[PDB]
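Methods — Computational structure assignment.
A single polypeptide chain was analysed. Its primary sequence is given first, followed by the predicted tertiary structure written as structure tokens.
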Amino acid sequence: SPPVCGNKILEQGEDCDCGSPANCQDRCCNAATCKLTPGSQCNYGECCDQCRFKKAGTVCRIARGDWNDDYCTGKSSDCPWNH
């Protein structure tokens, strides 16, 4: 495989230093630019999947059981518990 531009990110995937050439200027990741590329709303997180926010309604968390449930809002990298 190509050279890990920025070393295989050990916790990024868009954050920076993607390293993994599979994303180095392609998979919404900048391994040569230490950052995420256009189209990527979020590098990663509760409301971050692939290259966009987890469409509102995507349960990312939940307190204990099922009352309000934690759901994404498709407008942020965070998923509110709805509490």
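Note: The beta strands are 29-30, 35-36, 48-49, 52-53, 59-61, 70-71.
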